[PDB]
């Protein structure tokens, strides 16, 4: 899975909770105000049975979403 998940003014810190919807973190690219920007994370492999990140393989480095990934 790869989700784009912030209407953010500044670069955030990568999620720590291994849940496909992270801690209060959206699952789809939301709408933004002009000042804010979009940041995604190349989420590690997802486990459909548990619907969360498999043991290990934490979230990738958060990078501002420019155009398309």
């Amino acid at each position: 899975t790869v989700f784009i998940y912030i209407i953010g003014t500044s670069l955030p810190a990568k999620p720590t909770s291994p849940a496909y919807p992270p801690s209060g973190w959206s699952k789809t690219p939301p709408n933004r105000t002009s000042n804010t920007q979009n940041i995604y994370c190349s989420t590690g492999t997802l486990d459909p049975v548990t619907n969360q990140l498999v043991s290990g393989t934490s979230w990738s480095d958060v990078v501002q979403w420019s155009g398309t990934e």
Partner: protein, 105 residues
């Protein structure tokens, strides 16, 4: 007058949800004290969507939320998205100063 978020594969295609619109500062600006630009947005079937007046900034930031909420409903009364867009901009001074010929991309 161009769109920053344009697809490299082909010209005249914006990939991101929000259209970024930028243009050069008008020449002979120092000649006139105060200036501003008027930007109009048109649909595929030629219905104006918004007339926005911008002053002191040359980089407009069109938003998806605008395009849906303020435009689709106002033009049809129902939720929707406009994919084909159109933009025209004029440079207007104050004391009866107006550019000639519009400008688009």
């Amino acid at each position: 007058f161009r769109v920053v978020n344009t697809a490299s594969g082909d010209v005249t295609e914006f990939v991101g949800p929000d259209v970024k619109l930028a243009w050069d500062k008008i020449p002979e600006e120092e000649i006139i004290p105060e200036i501003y630009y008027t930007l109009e947005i048109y649909d595929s079937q030629d219905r104006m969507l918004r007339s926005v007046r911008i002053e002191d900034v040359y980089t407009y930031d069109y938003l998806l939320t605008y395009n849906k909420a303020d435009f689709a409903l106002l033009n049809s009364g129902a939720l929707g998205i406009n994919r084909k867009l159109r933009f025209r901009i004029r440079a207007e001074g104050e004391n009866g100063e107006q550019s000639v010929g519009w400008a688009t991309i």
